[PDB]
From a paper:
To further investigate the structural significance of the AS, we generated hBest11–345 and bBest21–345, and solved their structures in the presence of 5 mM Ca2+ at 2.4 Å and 1.9 Å, respectively. Remarkably, both structures exhibited 100% of particles with a fully open neck, in sharp contrast to the only ~10% particles with partially or fully open neck in WT hBest1 and hBest2, respectively. Although a fully open neck was observed in hBest11–345, it is unclear whether or how the neck in hBest1, in the presence of the AS, adapts to the fully open conformation in physiological conditions. Remarkably, hBest11–345 and hBest21–345 were indistinguishable, both displaying robust leak currents with similar amplitudes in the absence of Ca2+ and significantly increased currents with similar amplitudes at 1 μM Ca2+ compared to the respective FL channels (using two-tailed unpaired Student t test), which is consistent with the 100% fully open neck in their structures. Remarkably, removing the AS from hBest1 and hBest2 results in truncation mutants that both exhibit a fully open neck in 100% of Ca2+-bound particles in cryo-EM and conduct indistinguishable and significantly elevated currents in patch clamp, while swapping the AS between hBest1 and hBest2 results in chimeric mutants with exchanged channel activities.
Author numbering:
A (entry chain C), B (entry chain D), C (entry chain E), D (entry chain A), E (entry chain B): 2 to 339
The structure:
């Protein structure tokens, strides 16, 4: 993701005008290639019309240009594209809200699971590891970035998410469907064992651990759902057709006809169709933003930093439950004490 | 459902343009039959006008064409169709969010319900079976796909969702209304029996089981609600009338009048009304998407894979609570251990 | 309600086109009377203009017709009516989501409240009855259908919702405001008595019962809120004025002027203003849908089946907690067992 | 609030047309004064133009009228006003959903807090009083109606919400900020004392009491938030400017020019600009509805009955926990018993 | 923030018209500098056109003015700006809802954590301090105002949020990422220690403390998310380009051409383009409101009073748990007692 929230903390002169000079995560980066293809086609058509067609061919071309410019408005481009973009943006933020953070769980696993010995350490680390393993198994499914980082389960084994025992146990349980759900069943059985073994003192704390873990399940499930149930392919096809039809008809309708013939609206020849390029910038940029956001777990500049999230989550989880377990700052009176 | 989320992970040149070449779940599949009927009617009208009407009849037809094309905009097609489609898409995603997944419950039933003997196995399998049975009873009500798979309760008996004892007990409890609610009462009474019999060690875990099961009830109830309370038939009728009236008036208003008479906007005869066909594609495609999504539990390409969900849920539930109960990977220090 | 969800399970040719031939719950049923009044007024005005006015009177009428048709667009009918309808539809579905279903509670009352003797039966039936009584007291307030079924509390007594003791106890507690809240206080005091008397074994189950009951309270409260706080009367008045002003000005603006005088847009006389009737169908139908949905607890075809819900809820609640208490199907291994 | 939900239970002929004849809470009441000022200004301008200006002055005035009527559409009145009104209506209903009702809490305080003696009565009444006191302290902050009823804390003391001891304890704790939060800390410390003193038998019930009370806190906090964080003053200023600029330009643009000069659109002089008055009714009425709803805790006809809510809440709370504690109807078999 | 909720409690004549005379938090303050730059450029262009260009240059300029004014509508300024502003306003209110208030937690810490001695005081103050420290660590990240108040952790130490021991313990745990999460792990380990040490009597109260604290975590996480995941930079760039392109083309298209040449729409020269300035006020004001709200934790007039919130929260938390612990008003019968 490209963050600029600090830069726009206060309304000031120009404001978003300083943001126009940004390349990474910008509309220019998303639009230049399609724009250059449109620019080439437009000028090829202009050159064909001006230096290839005969007089009667030029008259026919001019009729077709006035016809196309007249029936540009039949295309409900605003209608279709507005609907599509609102759908994509809603889904994008819903996808971000369902990224699982183990912080609520790691605080409970650090507090409730007793023992400063080797076995307590191992139990706490393995519980949070199950939480982080569940998240990374769902993320490698839903994220092309994470999958490229972890092409197989053995890659998770060499990265600390999975032990060899865990790996072979998952291979034994292999089912045709996705097996991201397994660490939750592992977490429940391990936490029950811990409670029965006296490492968890009361089953109310055990209830509290399982609720936090199940919250993460529900978030992972939402991620699974957004990956599986795409925006209906009909809508993507329709909005794609709307944008392409609009600019394909602009390739002819927005030519500068011979100003000698004094057609209404064609009196002045400016060579560069500035307003047509502005409409391309707005409409195609708008579509290209939707193309970027439709799967926010790709490798786009403004896609979520899913690998960063995975690494941070595992580091913070292991710190919080191993080194921070019953390690507290000395409790001393504050500055406002008396 | 047709999933393409991986294909659109990154914004790239064309992007959704590769999706235009997809047939399954496509706008072409939804539109071709209605489009071919519209195409036939339009050209029949053109041929009648050009080779059947006399001169004065042609003048009257031309007057009617200019009148119809002038009063095409009285039809609030964008207004009505936008409202309808937003309603349908909201309901569609709400319907997906209320598909019950037993994962939260199966982890609790695997952890809390004690015993590696025959009776423990049987108790855990029957509890998750009650959850899966409740889901399949509601789904066969709300889903034509599931109902075709399970025309009667005996079909559920031969598929492992229902035992003969369960089947005869449901026949004894028969009420005029839908009896999807029964497995929840079975689950509560069995879980209470389990707790009293010592298979559940503490009533806090019993509370936790009943909360998860009741969550699934609330999801099933939402599914029942969306199946029963249709989008008001007035709205479907109105949007249907709007789209059909628009294209029925286009059948005459969008004819290419005699270019000899030099009517304004009718100077050029292109035979093929490209913009009228594009408007058909946008508006009728938009309606046909709503027709597909209005009941997402049908047998449409882009409808939910409800049978797949049912089979997966039962397989994963039974695995998680029977074979995964107190079967844990050997707890060994991770790669980051020290 | 009129349900057609099964009929529209798959996108097919015509699709909603088979729904056009439905009378119950249809736009035709909602529109015919107002439409027939509009049809009579329009033709009366046409006949007055054509067979009553003198030549100079006809010229003045024609001026007024062209003026009215020109300033039809000043009326923000789409603006106002779109806002109103989105408000009504949101509130309509929110009202449905807050219909209380005792299923979550009846499963807990069947499981937790112990005793197969007379006193256990009586206690379980009275607890669910308090839940159903609270719902029917709020529903008879918010629903004209339920109130017509139960004009007084004695009608609830003869229908099994209320005992004579309960009736006289409510008469003793009479307050100026609505007393739907009383069964919740009864439920809490009875459930506490049950727990102290040993019919509920652990206060965690007692907590679980009170949470479910309080959920139903919060739903009933929402119903109370939607009944009391109407859509602001200003909005209903404004949208009513917008629709009526639009069609009152159409009564004159949409007349077919003398085609002899060759007014622009009045060249062709079709007698029947098809597009004006289509606009009536869209706009007035749209308003009439809002009039139907604004109170979904009336006796409209597409209003909620509140009496059906009340009867079903009481039947299912009493079955679930009396006949289904500790009556379980014989637990036998499933088909997938081994 | 003005409630008419019963009146609109069924769609019928006219429907909202009977609501047009309502004065209290009506658009007429909100619009008449501004409308009468607009009506006076319009006719003053007409009289100045017709009986004060010379011929060349009349020509200049007519030029300015045609200019103004031409550039009326530059004002994005629909854009701005639609955005503003959707914001206001969302906030209005969110404000209503966060009015705290003690019903969930009063049922728990009636059930859990034991003792039919003086001390039990006093403890239960004081707990619900803390809940009602917290609500009335936040409401007198956010509601001008409640503040006028209770100008000082001593007014709360004479109305039964606050005891003299409670009053002096709040005066001792005085902080620069609002002290609505204090009764929640009182409720928690009193409920803990009650539990330690054996009036609450189990800490699970104590947990249940504190959760309900904290829910009311979160609702009161939302009310505090909506009172403090106004709709941004920029939006109110902009929508105010949009509506006023539109009608100030209508004062000249919508004059009926001399019909002798036969200006396009000015052929017919009707003296009364019916469509301009209709646009005033729609747009200014729409703004005035937003002005009414922007603070729903004022003394407007359609503002919430906050004083009624406060009185009802205290009466019902005290009844439910004092007179209804362990007072149950005799449990007798229902009509459906056997 | 600028609050005026009390001022608009009732709909009255003018209403928001008294708000037009407000400078702090006003549209005038947000618009004047950009407006003055636009005003200078417009009049410079007018003076160049009127007193610098030759006759043929004036004809060319007039052609370009009529071209620009004709193709002003190609810019989807309403489309783009409406989408952007709805996104910003949603995010703004979501950001406010996720400001953490310790009131729910401080009531539980005051009630549950026992002891009127030094150690009880110290334990209660340190628990709420951990809650307030977590909030201030996230706020100094997401808020430029708080960061300017607390440039380093030592500034938090001198302000009472952090003890020197806490400061050195955080320095020892330093990770590359943000360490706002640490006080939650501290809170969980301290609350567990308190429970084991008998200061918390039952683990149900311990569960209740950890749930409240974890709620605050989830709110802080949302704040972190809104700070990190900006509105996509593509949208800000596009809306910026739309507004600037619209007014840059207005600089030429909205000039008053020579009225001698009697161009259509240019008959009257008013020197001041009132409607162009009104459109600037609406559109640029609308953008500038979005610029103000996009980061509501800056130092803008209408930005959240985050420093005030932080100070209030710490003062109220410390009061509630130290001075208000087991300090209750004398429980005496209320005015309605009997
Ligand atoms: C071609 C179509 C549109 C593309 C043009 C986009 C404009 C480019 C602006 C880029 C700003 C440079 C960044 C910077 O560092 O510079 C910001 C500067 C300080 O602050 C300012 O932006 C100073 C001026 C503040 C705003 C200008 C007046 C606003 C009126 C709208 C347009 C009419 C101009 C008179
Ligand atoms: C008839 C009305 C509309 C229907 C036409 C729809 C267009 C069909 C495109 C189908 C793409 C084929 C799939 C593929 O495998 O090919 C993708 C290719 C690599 O990537 C590309 O699509 C290469 C070009 C990238 C986009 C083209 C420029 C965008 C400007 C808009 C239109 C103006 C054209 C100059
Ligand atoms: C007066 C203004 C509008 C009112 C007219 C509404 C149309 C009435 C249709 C009613 C369908 C009868 C029900 C049925 O049982 O019959 C469904 C039939 C099989 O399936 C079909 O509906 C067969 C044809 C499929 C759709 C027709 C082509 C769609 C193109 C739009 C209009 C242009 C027509 C060429
Ligand atoms: C704008 C003014 C429109 C006014 C309506 C015109 C009159 C319509 C037919 C007369 C009313 C039907 C009476 C009835 O009691 O009919 C029952 C029956 C089953 O109705 P069901 O399908 O709900 O079961 O009706 C059927 O024959 C099935 C449905 C027949 C009604 C729909 C006709 C299509 C278009 C009408 C508009 C012209
Ligand atoms: C000046 C601009 C608009 C202002 C006019 C607003 C209209 C005033 C209606 C007030 C109804 C009186 C209340 C009542 O007690 O009377 C309701 C009556 C029974 O039910 C009816 O309203 C009987 C007739 C049902 C509706 C009339 C036909 C609807 C077509 C739209 C307009 C064209 C008229 C032919
Ligand atoms: C744009 C400017 C509009 C200004 C309004 C014109 C004057 C309206 C009548 C005078 C005010 C009524 C005074 C009052 O105190 O009246 C009470 C009474 C019951 O009112 P209630 O039904 O709320 O009970 O009013 C009734 O007679 C029932 C309702 C009567 C008022 C509604 C009249 C319909 C259209 C008025 C617009 C012209
Ligand atoms: C240049 C483009 C727009 C800018 C003009 C904005 C108007 C400025 C109003 C400022 C109010 C001053 C504050 C105050 O203390 O004074 C409020 C006064 C009492 O209450 C009133 O505002 C008394 C009159 C109530 C509203 C006026 C009639 C509304 C009709 C719309 C416009 C047509 C005017 C005839
Ligand atoms: Ca992407
Ligand atoms: Ca379907
Ligand atoms: Ca109704
Ligand atoms: Ca108000
Ligand atoms: Ca700001």
């Amino acid at each position: 993701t490209i963050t600029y929230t600090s830069q726009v903390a206060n309304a000031r002169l120009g404001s978003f005008s300083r943001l126009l000079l940004c390349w990474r995560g910008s509309i220019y980066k998303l639009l230049y290639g399609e724009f250059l293809i449109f620019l080439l086609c437009y000028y090829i058509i202009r050159f064909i019309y001006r230096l290839a067609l005969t007089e009667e061919q030029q008259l026919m071309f001019e009729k077709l240009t006035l016809y196309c410019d007249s029936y540009i408005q039949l295309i409900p481009i605003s209608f279709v594209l507005g609907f599509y973009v609102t759908l994509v943006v809603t889904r994008w933020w819903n996808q971000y809200e369902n990224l699982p953070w183990p912080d609520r769980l790691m605080s409970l696993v650090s507090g409730f699971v007793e023992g400063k010995d080797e076995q307590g350490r191992l139990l706490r680390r393995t519980l949070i590891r199950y939480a982080n393993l569940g998240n990374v198994l769902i993320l490698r499914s839903v994220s092309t970035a994470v999958y490229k980082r972890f092409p197989s389960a053995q890659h998770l084994v060499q990265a600390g998410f999975m032990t060899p025992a865990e790996h072979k146990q998952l291979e034994k349980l292999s089912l045709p469907h996705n097996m991201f759900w397994v660490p939750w069943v592992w977490f429940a059985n391990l936490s029950m064992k811990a409670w029965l073994g006296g490492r968890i003192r009361d089953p109310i704390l055990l209830q509290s651990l399982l609720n936090e873990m199940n919250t993460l399940r529900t978030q992972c499930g939402h991620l699974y759902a957004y990956d599986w149930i795409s925006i209906p392919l009909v809508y993507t096809q329709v909005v794609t057709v709307a944008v392409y039809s609009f600019f394909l008809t602009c390739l002819v309708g927005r030519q500068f006809l011979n100003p000698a013939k004094a057609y209404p609206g064609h009196e002045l020849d400016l060579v560069v169709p500035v307003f047509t390029f502005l409409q391309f910038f707005f409409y195609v940029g708008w579509l290209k933003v939707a193309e970027q956001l439709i799967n926010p777990f790709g490798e786009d500049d403004d896609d979520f930093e899913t690998n960063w999230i995975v690494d941070r989550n595992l580091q913070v989880s292991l710190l919080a439950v191993d080194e921070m377990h019953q390690d507290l700052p000395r409790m001393e009176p504050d500055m406002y004490w008396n």
